[PDB]
Amino acid sequence: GVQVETISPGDGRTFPKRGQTCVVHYTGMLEDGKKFDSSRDRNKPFKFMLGKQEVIRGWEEGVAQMSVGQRAKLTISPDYAYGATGHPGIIPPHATLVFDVELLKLE
Ligand SMILES: CC[C@@H]1/C=C(\C)[C@@H](O)[C@H](C)C[C@H](OC)[C@H]2O[C@@](O)(C(=O)C(=O)N3CCCC[C@H]3C(=O)O[C@H](/C(C)=C/[C@@H]3CC[C@@H](O)[C@H](OC)C3)[C@H](C)[C@@H](O)CC1=O)[C@H](C)C[C@@H]2OC
């Protein structure tokens, strides 16, 4: 599944609902620590809509647990990420992933 470990607290009140757009910054790394992506390096917040099957299960369920302003470490088992398939040339098969995610606002 997905573990959510808080880095910095959010408001504890405003949680994303199905049909709302989450605006986040994130960094993604493999379990061994190798960074593979960062919206911060891209200098553009990442947007996705909850309930629209847009993101890996670990995100769909992990970000749902966050409130606006919260920064958290999401540790995600391969089955809640890219599984045995992986993501060609980025995510190897059977990868546990770690995301640093900050929920900036809802739209
Ligand atoms: C068509 C291009 C389209 C690309 C964009 C909109 C880009 O602008 C984004 C900024 C994405 C990044 O582009 C540089 C890049 O992000 C990663 O690096 C990454 O950090 C990641 O893991 N993310 C992104 C942040 C949210 C969680 C997760 C994800 O869920 O991503 C989603 C994802 C890949 C879902 C799979 C869909 C197929 C299912 O079969 C599989 O089911 C297991 C899940 C992603 C947002 C898709 O909805 C949309 C796209 O892929 C991926 C390793 C590879 C991906 O590039 C492709």
Side-chain angles (χ1 to χ4, degrees):
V2 52
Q3 301 169 253
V4 181
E5 298 177 284
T6 301
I7 293 160
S8 186
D11 68 9
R13 297 180 294 104
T14 318
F15 298 81
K17 76 176 179 172
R18 180 188 67 255
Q20 284 187 298
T21 292
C22 305
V23 185
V24 306
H25 265 312
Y26 74 91
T27 53
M29 75 178 68
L30 306 178
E31 198 167 44
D32 55 37
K34 196 189 180 182
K35 173 184 166 179
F36 62 81
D37 198 1
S38 166
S39 62
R40 301 187 184 276
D41 291 358
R42 195 159 50 242
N43 281 300
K44 192 193 184 189
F46 173 70
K47 301 187 180 187
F48 77 99
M49 190 180 282
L50 197 72
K52 292 281 277 177
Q53 299 95 40
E54 288 173 12
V55 292
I56 55 173
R57 202 175 163 180
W59 267 61
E60 188 75 20
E61 291 187 14
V63 178
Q65 295 176 47
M66 298 178 60
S67 57
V68 173
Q70 191 178 350
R71 194 164 175 171
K73 182 194 185 182
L74 281 51
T75 299
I76 307 172
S77 58
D79 48 288
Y80 268 58
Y82 300 100
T85 303
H87 201 297
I90 308 174
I91 307 299
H94 325 294
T96 306
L97 304 186
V98 173
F99 287 88
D100 182 322
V101 180
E102 181 184 2
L103 182 57
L104 302 164
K105 57 173 176 194
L106 305 174
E107 284 183 351

